[PDB]
Design a protein around this motif. Structure first.
Motif, PDB file in Angstrom:
ATOM      1  N   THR A   1       0.842  -1.179   0.000  1.00 30.10           N
ATOM      2  CA  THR A   1       0.000   0.000   0.000  1.00 30.10           C
ATOM      3  C   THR A   1       0.884   1.237   0.000  1.00 30.10           C
TER       4      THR A   1
ATOM      5  N   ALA B   1      -2.920   1.154  -3.626  1.00 33.75           N
ATOM      6  CA  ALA B   1      -2.523  -0.175  -3.187  1.00 33.75           C
ATOM      7  C   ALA B   1      -2.517  -1.099  -4.390  1.00 33.75           C
TER       8      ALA B   1
ATOM      9  N   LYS C   1      -8.022  -4.093  -1.468  1.00 32.37           N
ATOM     10  CA  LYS C   1      -7.217  -3.845  -0.278  1.00 32.37           C
ATOM     11  C   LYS C   1      -7.335  -2.420   0.238  1.00 32.37           C
ATOM     12  N   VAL C   2      -8.459  -1.759  -0.014  1.00 28.98           N
ATOM     13  CA  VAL C   2      -8.788  -0.487   0.616  1.00 28.98           C
ATOM     14  C   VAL C   2     -10.219  -0.580   1.117  1.00 28.98           C
TER      15      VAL C   2
ATOM     16  N   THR D   1      -6.637   0.820   4.919  1.00 28.61           N
ATOM     17  CA  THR D   1      -5.947  -0.163   4.104  1.00 28.61           C
ATOM     18  C   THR D   1      -5.719  -1.443   4.891  1.00 28.61           C
TER      19      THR D   1
ATOM     20  N   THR E   1      -1.940  -0.602   8.739  1.00 33.04           N
ATOM     21  CA  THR E   1      -2.879   0.120   7.898  1.00 33.04           C
ATOM     22  C   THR E   1      -2.635   1.616   7.945  1.00 33.04           C
TER      23      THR E   1
END
Lengths: 234, 216, 232, 234, 230, 213, 233, 200, 234
Positions: H3, H16, H33-34, H44, H99
């Motif tokens: 990311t 990402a 992936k968000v 994330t 994240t």
């Protein structure tokens, strides 16, 4: 009345003095009628509309996978009792992987609603179930009561002025153990059509019925599906 | 795991037109020591279901008192409704998976069988909870040795009379007498049919050591 | 107001929540139990209300441990409760000590259970008299009867219910000791038809040498043989 | 372990324990506050603390953390528990979101706490009533007044003490737009409002002001005298 | 199970109704004297049974708390036995943590501490036994009395049980600050001799002393000995 | 000291077309080097429109199907509405995660079709991470069936073939050839795949044998 | 006195039929389910005029598509409104979808007749929740509103009145609603509030109105929208 | 997973990749992936595919409860803080995540970084992931606060393009987000190959 | 049972607490022990039970209890309860040391004891602690200070307040608030006790210091025979 602090006490004759008064509290509830054939047992309920209009506080309930009920008394307490009955019926689906038999079902709820009758400061489950299901043998039907004393009955009616429905239904037991679905539920609706205040109709709105038995799931007939059941003039 | 537990070796079974026959040797082998000879590993339960045990025998006595107490308890409700061998198999499965799920596992590995209302039944319940149904079962080294003779005849004809199945498991039990080290001579053979559960123990194996004197 | 609580005595030592439970089984039907040398025969009066109830709508001859029985009198909820915990009690005995439960220990155990349940204002007493009964191969035909007070006595021909004032007399005049239970199954109907003074759709169960320590609703043939003791 | 249900519904929907707490706040001090559009201001007519009090520990005016502060009225010892739990959870709400904690949220915590003591088993719901004043991230000098039934209102005078129905009808009469200035007309309105009830501020009144998320300053009786003199001069 | 509400409560006058009833049940109890003396105490009491039928060597009223501390009561019978059970247990907690026999003052602290919560705490009625304490504890002897309220006071002499006003006035008359050994026993005997309801039998009294070597009961051959020396 | 998992094997596949979802299966459950049985399904009919595939440790696969079956029933007459497919995927994600620290060692694939009718297929790791796809077999021959229907379904690394949408004849012939190939090449073959196939009118279930060794 | 878990010589519980009272006490709220939305309104009964009227929360949004309307003993609902929204985001969390209105109404009404003196740990309730409310919400079945009781009884409703005006406003609402919204049910419902009027001619300071429409999520009406409607009457 | 996120004068880009390994075999080439916890913030995921998905799922539940409970948009420091509280009180249990919590609030562009150990730091730019330090290098060569929108997008596309080119455990596609004072939008779903032919 | 409970935690219809103001009348039956502070330290001045010879030796009396090196407390009302609570609060003092290595500034201690004593009158169904005990102490923060509390829960700085019977009004005409000069505080103490007297029937105790550490003296015998002849007239 010093017997008002009172599911611990006994009236001096024999009376426990309020869990028969919970039986009064299901005499006050709305009328219903269930019965059984040799093959499949049915349930029939009229639904009171104490409002503008409604679903009329839907009575007969899906608990199961063929062990259906018909409540008549308190509604929140009824829903608590059928979350119990529902959850452990699914627990017997989980563990043993068979249908839970109807007799052990009604007996252990007959031991579950029996505990607050025993102990202190806890009201009985003021609801009169009229459960009905099809186990291995013939399709049983059980009235149970807030006095925790169920009855392996056939063709029972409980609720408001349901005694007249019983005395119709007591003198018409001879045409049970025959009398298939199309002519059976007519024979139950004309048993229900005496608890009404003598003015003419089992409408499609207020009558909700349930069918359970051989080779069919416990099936709820609501506002639309009760309309193919139509006959009788009285 | 912690001690030399008292084990068995094998409960092998096959179903047949009629009922289902399971067989096991009476042996209480304390880790390469036949400490207990006359020791029955074939439980009778209600009249249409049977039960074996291959692993630890102490856990089988635990299971014979909880199966026994459960089946007499639901037996005395009256109203018919005995356990089909569906429910003994499924309850034993959930008992063992709920037993290894807390890492305190039952160590025995049995096969339960029985003749229901319509047809027979022969189900395997593993130490870990690996449970299934099969036309013919065997536990332990029998699952390596008796299992080829069982799933050879049953691939040819999946229909057996009672004498063919009984001689089949007698012959497989003779093979486990020949090859399995933790195996004893006498064995209980035990059959459930339309008339119910019956246990014919103990039997013997006619040994064939005629190939011994050709070794030089 | 020395009433209404089981933890409060009378001014002459009489816990009124027990004797109010005792009349609470005196307003319920009879259930007689007759001992003889090959076992104990029960017989329960039924007071079938409507035609809507089928045969055995409420069991009043329960069984507990595959040999002891449960002829009950009072509230069927309370009697059914102590029936199932008697089942759990013989379950803990057979699971715990292996040996099949002797009945004296079960009657003393359930007896002190329902007695120790009458020492507190946080519980009511039970409202159900009931009786037990069985025999092991060397026990003798043991039966016991337990009040809501919790007292348990060994009897021969005890009878609880509404018409036990009538029922104790015929069981006393019946020859008690030496007959072989089949006749007394038949003779039980004579007691039940005398004490019923008003559908009386009775029900019988026993344990005997025809049973080898079990229970059966009758098998079903004396129901059309002991029915022939009408007109007496 | 005491489990008697105290706060129970009587007939005609009257929850008597809560109205008994309403007399318990009717029999206290006379607290008052004014939302003065850039400042907020309190005041509580105190008794004879000059005879032999300590003025440091007669405080009807406390401080929650820095900006929000409250003036209880009733029973004066069940209040301090609510002060302590308000300070504790106020520090917890500085732990999570890290703000100058908004006055709405802490007064919802107080009203939710007292409503949680109108529910639990046997613990006598409080006899206090608050004046949660303060600020937020952007000025907005919001005032709040709770209740022993756990009902908070975002009103602007809320004289809720003992002889304060006269003060809140006076403040209904005499608060429209003349107190929109910095401090003098607002504090003059407060000390006029409590000098309606008792006597001179050299022995009786004490106040507190709060300005734009700094300087919670009380007023010693030398300074209160100047304002009192101005009011007297009128 | 349990109650968890106090049955001992405040009167509208502003006093405890149960505790004055407990002092009534003490005042209807058997009379018992206790005399603090210059080296050691004497705690006499009166054991009148119903008939001459019982074993007078079976139950005691002088009985020690494990080292050198005896305690005698006046009032309810078995509530005393509970207080002996609790008192021996508290003295053994103290002995296992501090490795000395307990000072008498601390034992009276803890016995008065356990008698307090029975004036509160869930349905229990207060004990109604105002037992009194002895003890040699280093240098000079001690004497106390734990009322069923929970208060305690130390003195030179007291009585309790029946007609204890005559015991307190009579011991106020005949007491000397140096009056030390068996003369205290003498006046204790002629304090129980004052009423006794008759004839002064040695099997109906028992005394206990704390003569710098542990509390010990007196054998029945020693009380009758001084009953011969009256 | 105990090793509470074994790998009972089995490979299960599901393909999402435009009005269907071919949930394939295999049969042979087996650990160590001896097989147990050749009857065992691995596609379970949850609702009329949702079919799970379930491979890995067989006892925990079995208990997991008992839990998701009984809680589907616990949903269905708590709201008087049947489950959808994505909601099955969500609650099975939190059932798989809810016992993380002694995890459900099971690779399960949920086929079925959406609310509007188009088929979807949700894939899972044994701790719970759902993505909707149109392929992704899982569990024993996961890394064997995947590159074929990366190509013959996804058309990746492939120029202008003028790719058509799938149907119940091209994708029907695309499931049998990959399981006879994995019947050749994997050890945990299966002898008779039982393709629980889902459609708009209902559900049927074709079976055909394999390399039986 | 007697306790909470006792039945009354009429036939019902004491605390339940006493919890039907203290609903006549308190403000009045009304709701109309239509074919394209559901409108809620409440005259929140401001006491003094010295004050701020826009913080008497009687229209509370459970989720984006469920809004409730309580009355009676106010602020006793906040625990079960808390249970309503926590159960709502638990449903969206574990099932990744919207809800019905009978699932939040199913979940709240289980907490109504769940109390008692001697029970489990003292975090339980003593008195029943003396607050009657109704969840106006839109579903994939349809817009609908579920009138609860303090007894745990909840019913399907399309035109329901609570509060002190539970007889005259309900009987007036019984004869004026059959068809659909078409923008005028919200103007023929404050007209019922216009007949109800206690203290003030229903301006945009003493009534709170909010609609839930299937296109949007909800709309708690601000002041100029309200007095835009009040100008039309 | 790789990311990347960076704030500037117009909101913050969050980009990402889209692959999800299983040690060496790879599961999907298209993974979201968000996590879009509301139409004002994001979040994330950087490893432990059920851990990170469960805890930003549960963060979406808790922040929505904050939206209902205090009738305000949640501040980004609150969401990152409570995330750090719960995954802090599962520290040491084999939990592994990490994240961004970006998103505009009433004070700033946000961009906090919360991981399994419970760092919970503010930032100007980050890129968490498996390789991901490649992203650091190339992003921090072309980053300035005085960028406009388009070469910020090309800074993210080139940034995790090179971070997916050089790393093995990354690739697939690239989604990109540019949140500011209206909420997130989506500006890309490009894969690696079309970026390779786009930029030679 | 609910017939048996005394129901201590109930508001009156007049709003007050029945079991709390019954404790306030318990103070007026038995209670003495005023306290005077100066610019120098603070003293208690107390009364024993009666004239009854029969009392050998008190180490400290039944009235003045030591709590730290720099605090002490005196007790009114029921003596059985307060003993318990003073050991209870003594625990509190020491654990503040264990938490902070400070000698516990006394307002923390009074706040803690008043919170737990308020907790006994808040819930639990028990009787409240029938003692209006008071406290003397010193901290480095403030000066010499005494606090005074009651069974209701509130407290305060009560510079010369006495407790028990015959209520302090003369002291609020005689105490010089600025300077007091503790010898003359002894003189005022034996004035008030001389109106309401050797150490057979008095118990006076002072708190002073030397070089920083506090000294709590119990004013041994012959000092009382000094001050009792320090009158002629008064």
């Amino acid at each position: 009345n010093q017997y008002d602090n009172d599911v611990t006490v006994w009236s001096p004759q024999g009376r426990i003095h309020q869990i028969e008064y919970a039986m009064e509290a299901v005499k006050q509830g709305s009328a219903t009628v269930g019965l059984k054939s040799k093959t499949h047992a049915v349930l029939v309920a009229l639904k009171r509309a104490q409002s503008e209009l409604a679903a009329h506080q839907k009575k007969i309930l899906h608990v199961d996978n063929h062990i259906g009920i018909s409540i008549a008394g308190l509604t929140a307490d009824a829903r608590l009792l059928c979350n119990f009955m529902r959850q452990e019926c699914l627990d017997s689906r989980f563990v043993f992987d068979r249908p839970l038999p109807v007799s052990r079902l009604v007996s252990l709820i007959g031991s579950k609603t029996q505990i607050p009758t025993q102990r202190y400061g806890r009201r009985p489950y003021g609801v009169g179930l009229l459960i009905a299901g099809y186990d291995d043998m013939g399709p049983h039907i059980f009235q149970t009561c807030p006095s925790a004393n169920y009855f392996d009955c056939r063709a029972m009616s409980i609720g408001a002025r349901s005694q007249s429905a019983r005395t119709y239904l007591e003198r018409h037991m001879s045409e049970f153990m025959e009398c298939n679905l199309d002519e059976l539920v007519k024979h139950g609706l004309r048993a229900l059509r005496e608890t009404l205040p003598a003015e003419q109709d089992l409408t499609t709105k207020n009558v909700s019925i349930g069918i359970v038995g051989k080779d069919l799931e416990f099936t709820i007939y609501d506002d639309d599906d009760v309309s193919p059941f139509l006959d009788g003039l009285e | 795991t912690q001690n030399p537990m008292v084990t068995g070796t094998s409960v092998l079974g096959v179903k047949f037109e009629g009922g289902v026959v399971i067989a096991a040797d009476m042996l209480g082998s304390y880790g390469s020591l036949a400490r207990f000879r006359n020791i029955s590993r074939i439980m009778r339960v209600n009249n249409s279901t049977m039960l074996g045990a291959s692993g630890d025998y102490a856990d089988f006595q635990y299971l014979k008192q909880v199966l026994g107490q459960m089946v007499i308890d639901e037996e005395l409700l009256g109203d018919g409704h005995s356990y089909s061998p569906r429910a003994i198999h499924s309850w034993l499965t959930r008992a063992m998976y709920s037993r290894r799920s807390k890492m305190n596992p039952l160590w025995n590995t049995m096969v339960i069988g029985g003749y229901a209302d319509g047809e027979s039944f022969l189900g395997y319940v593993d130490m870990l909870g690996v449970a299934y149904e099969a036309p013919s079962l065997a536990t332990g080294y029998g699952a390596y040795l008796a299992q080829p003779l069982l799933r050879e005849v049953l691939e040819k004809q999946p229909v057996l009379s009672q004498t063919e199945a009984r001689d089949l498991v007698e012959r497989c039990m003779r093979v486990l007498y020949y090859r399995d080290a933790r195996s004893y001579n006498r064995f209980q053979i035990a059959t459930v049919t339309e008339k119910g559960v019956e246990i014919e123990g103990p039997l013997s194996t006619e040994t064939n050591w005629d190939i011994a004197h050709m070794i030089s | 107001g020395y009433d209404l609580s089981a933890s409060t005595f009378s001014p002459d030592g009489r816990v009124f929540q027990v004797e109010y439970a005792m009349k609470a089984v005196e307003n319920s039907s009879t259930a007689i139990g007759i001992r003889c040398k090959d076992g104990v025969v029960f017989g329960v009066e039924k007071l079938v209300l409507s035609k809507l109830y089928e045969e055995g709508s409420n069991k009043r001859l329960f069984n507990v441990d595959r040999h002891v029985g449960m002829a009950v009198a009072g509230l069927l909820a309370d009697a059914r409760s102590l029936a199932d915990i008697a089942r759990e009690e013989a379950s803990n005995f057979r699971s715990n000590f292996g040996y099949n439960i002797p009945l004296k220990h079960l009657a003393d155990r359930v007896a002190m259970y329902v007695h120790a349940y009458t020492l507190y204002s946080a519980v009511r007493p039970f409202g159900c008299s009931f009786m037990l009964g069985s025999y092991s191969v060397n026990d003798g035909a043991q039966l016991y009867m337990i009040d809501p007070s919790g007292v348990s006595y060994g009897y021969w021909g005890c009878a609880i219910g509404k018409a036990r004032q009538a029922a104790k007399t015929e069981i006393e005049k019946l020859q008690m000791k030496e007959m072989t239970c089949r006749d007394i199954v038949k003779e039980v109907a004579k007691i039940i038809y005398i004490v019923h003074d008003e559908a009386f759709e009775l029900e019988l169960s026993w344990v005997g040498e025809l049973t080898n320590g079990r229970h059966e609703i009758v098998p079903k043939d004396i129901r059309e043989e002991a029915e022939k003791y009408a007109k007496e | 372990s005491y489990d008697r249900a105290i706060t129970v519904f009587s007939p005609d929907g009257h929850l008597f324990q809560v109205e008994y707490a309403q007399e318990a706040v009717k029999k206290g001090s006379t607290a008052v506050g004014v939302r003065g559009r850039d400042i907020v201001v309190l005041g509580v007519e105190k008794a004879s603390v000059a005879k032999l009090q300590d003025e440091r520990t007669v405080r009807k005016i406390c401080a929650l953390d820095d900006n929000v502060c409250m003036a209880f009225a009733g029973l004066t010892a069940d209040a301090r528990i609510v002060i302590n739990r308000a300070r504790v959870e106020c520090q917890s709400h500085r732990l999570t979101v890290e703000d100058p904690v908004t006055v709405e949220y802490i007064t919802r915590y107080i009203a939710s706490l007292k409503q949680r003591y109108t529910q639990s088993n046997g613990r006598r719901p409080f006899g206090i009533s608050a004046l949660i004043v303060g600020f937020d991230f952007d000025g907005t000098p919001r005032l709040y007044q709770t209740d022993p039934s756990g009902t908070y209102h975002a009103w602007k005078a809320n004289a809720i003490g003992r002889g304060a129905k006269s003060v809140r009808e006076f403040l209904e009469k005499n608060y429209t737009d003349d107190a929109i200035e910095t401090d003098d007309l607002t504090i003059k309105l407060v000390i006029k409002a409590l000098l309606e009830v008792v006597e001179s501020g050299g022995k009786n009144i004490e106040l507190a002001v709060m300005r734009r998320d700094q300087s919670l300053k009380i007023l010693n009786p030398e300074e209160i005298e100047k304002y009192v003199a101005e009011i007297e001069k009128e | 199970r349990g109650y968890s509400f106090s049955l001992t409560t405040f009167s509208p006058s502003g006093k405890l109704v149960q505790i004055e009833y407990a002092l009534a049940a003490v005042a209807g109890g058997a009379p018992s004297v206790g005399i603090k003396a210059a080296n050691g105490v004497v705690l006499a009491t009166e054991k009148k049974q119903k008939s001459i039928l019982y074993d007078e060597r079976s139950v005691h009223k002088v009985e020690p708390i494990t080292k050198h501390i005896g305690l005698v009561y006046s009032g309810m019978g078995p509530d005393y036995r509970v207080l002996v059970h609790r008192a021996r247990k508290l003295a053994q907690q103290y002995y296992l943590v501090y490795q000395e026999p307990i000072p008498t003052a601390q034992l009276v602290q803890r016995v008065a501490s356990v008698m307090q919560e029975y004036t509160q705490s869930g349905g229990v009625r207060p004990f109604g036994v105002s037992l009194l304490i002895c003890g040699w504890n280093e240098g000079r002897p001690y004497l106390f009395q734990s009322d069923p309220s929970g208060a305690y006071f130390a003195w030179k002499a007291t009585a309790m049980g029946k007609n204890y006003v005559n015991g307190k006035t009579f011991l106020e008359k005949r007491y000397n600050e140096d009056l030390e050994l068996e003369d205290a026993i003498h006046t204790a005997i002629l304090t129980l001799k004052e009423s006794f309801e008759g004839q002064m039998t040695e099997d109906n009294i028992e005394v206990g002393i704390c003569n710098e070597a542990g509390f010990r009961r007196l054998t029945p051959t020693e009380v009758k000995d001084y009953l011969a020396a009256i | 000291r105990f090793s509470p998992y074994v790998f009972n094997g089995g490979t299960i596949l599901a393909i999402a077309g435009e009005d269907f979802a071919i949930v394939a299966s295999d049969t042979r459950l087996s650990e160590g080097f001896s097989i147990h049985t050749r009857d065992s399904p691995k596609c379970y009919k949850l609702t009329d429109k949702t079919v799970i595939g379930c491979s890995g440790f067989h006892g925990d696969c079995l208990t997991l199907t008992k839990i998701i079956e009984a809680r589907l029933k616990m949903y269905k007459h708590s709201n008087n509405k049947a489950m959808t497919t994505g909601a099955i995927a969500a609650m099975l994600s939190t059932i798989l995660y809810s016992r993380r620290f002694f995890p459900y060692y099971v690779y399960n694939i949920i086929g079925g079709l959406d609310e509007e009718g188009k088929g979807a297929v949700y894939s899972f790791d044994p701790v719970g991470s759902y993505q909707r796809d149109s392929f992704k077999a899982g569990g024993s021959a996961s890394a064997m069936l995947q590159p074929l229907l990366d190509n013959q379904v996804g058309f990746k690394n492939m120029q202008n073939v003028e790719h058509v949408p799938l149907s119940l004849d091209r994708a029907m012939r695309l499931v049998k050839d990959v399981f006879i190939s994995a019947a050749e090449r994997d050890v945990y073959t299966g002898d008779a795949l039982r393709i629980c196939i889902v459609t708009k009118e209902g559900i049927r279930e074709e079976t055909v044998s394999l390399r039986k060794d | 006195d007697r306790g909470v878990n006792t039945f009354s010589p009429e036939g019902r519980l004491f605390q339940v039929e006493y919890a039907i009272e203290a609903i006549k006490l308190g403000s009045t709220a009304i709701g109309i389910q239509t074919s394209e939305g559901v409108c809620l309104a409440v005259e929140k009964r401001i006491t003094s005029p010295l004050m701020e009227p826009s913080s008497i929360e009687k229209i509370v949004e459970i989720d984006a598509h469920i809004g409730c309307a309580m009355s009676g003993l106010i602020a006793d609902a906040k625990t079960l409104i808390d249970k309503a929204r926590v159960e709502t985001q638990n449903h969206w969390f574990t099932y990744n979808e919207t809800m019905t209105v009978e699932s939040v109404t199913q979940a709240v009404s289980n907490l109504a007749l769940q109390f008692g003196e001697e029970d489990a740990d003292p975090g339980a309730m003593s008195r029943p929740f003396g607050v009657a409310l109704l969840f106006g919400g839109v579903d994939e079945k349809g817009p609908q509103l579920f009138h609860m009781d303090p007894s745990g009884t909840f019913v399907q409703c399309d035109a329901r009145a609570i509060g002190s005006a539970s007889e005259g406003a309900q009987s007036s609402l019984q004869e004026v609603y059959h068809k659909s919204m078409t923008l005028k049910e919200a103007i023929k419902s404050s007209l019922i509030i216009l007949k109800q009027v206690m203290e003030e001619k229903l301006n945009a300071t003493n009534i709170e109105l909010a609609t839930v429409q299937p296109g949007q999520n909800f709309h708690m009406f601000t002041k100029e929208e309200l007095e835009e409607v009040i100008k039309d009457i | 997973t790789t990311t990347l996120a960076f704030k500037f004068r117009h909101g913050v880009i969050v980009a990402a990749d889209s692959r999800a390994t299983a040690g060496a075999y790879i599961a999907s080439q298209t993974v979201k992936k968000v996590i879009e916890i509301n139409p004002y913030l994001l979040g994330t995921m950087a490893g432990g595919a059920a851990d990170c998905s469960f805890w930003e799922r549960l963060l979406a539940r808790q922040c929505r409860i904050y939206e209902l409970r205090n009738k305000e948009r949640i501040s980004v420091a609150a969401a990152s803080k409570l995330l750090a509280n719960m995954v802090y009180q599962y520290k040491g249990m084999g939990l592994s995540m990490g994240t961004m919590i970006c998103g505009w609030d009433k004070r700033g562009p946000g961009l906090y970084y919360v991981d399994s150990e419970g760092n919970r730091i503010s930032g100007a730019t980050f890129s968490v992931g498996s390789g991901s330090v490649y992203a650091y290098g190339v992003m921090d060569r072309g980053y300035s606060y005085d960028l406009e929108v388009e070469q910020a997008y090309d800074l993210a596309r080139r940034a995790i393009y090179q971070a997916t080119y050089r790393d093995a455990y990354s690739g697939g596609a690239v989604n990109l987000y540019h949140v500011r004072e209206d909420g997130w939008i989506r500006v890309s779903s490009d894969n690696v190959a079309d970026l390779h032919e786009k930029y030679s | 049972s609910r017939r048996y409970d005394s129901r201590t935690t109930i508001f009156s219809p007049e709003g007050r607490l029945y079991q709390v103001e019954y404790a306030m009348e318990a103070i007026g039956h038995a209670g003495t022990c005023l306290g005077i502070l100066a610019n120098d330290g603070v003293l208690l001045a107390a009364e024993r039970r009666n004239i009854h010879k029969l009392l050998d030796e008190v180490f400290f009396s039944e009235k003045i209890y030591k709590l730290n090196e720099d605090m002490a407390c005196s007790v009114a009302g029921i003596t059985s309860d307060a003993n318990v609570l003073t050991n209870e609060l003594r625990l509190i003092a020491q654990r503040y040391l264990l938490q902070y290595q400070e000698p516990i500034p006394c307002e923390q201690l009074v706040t803690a004891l008043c919170d737990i004593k308020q907790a006994y009158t808040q819930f639990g169904g028990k009787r409240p602690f029938g003692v209006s005990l008071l406290y003397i102490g010193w901290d480095k923060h403030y000066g010499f200070q005494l606090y005074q509390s009651d069974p209701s829960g509130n407290y305060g700085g009560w510079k010369a307040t006495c407790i028990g019977n015959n209520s302090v009004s003369m002291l609020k005409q005689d105490y010089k608030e600025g300077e007091m000069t503790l010898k003359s505080a002894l003189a005022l103490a034996i004035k008030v006790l001389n109106k309401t007297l050797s150490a057979e029937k008095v118990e006076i105790a002072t708190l002073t210091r030397e070089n920083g550490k506090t000294v709590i003296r119990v004013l041994k015998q012959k000092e009382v025979e000094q001050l009792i002849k320090k009158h002629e007239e008064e």
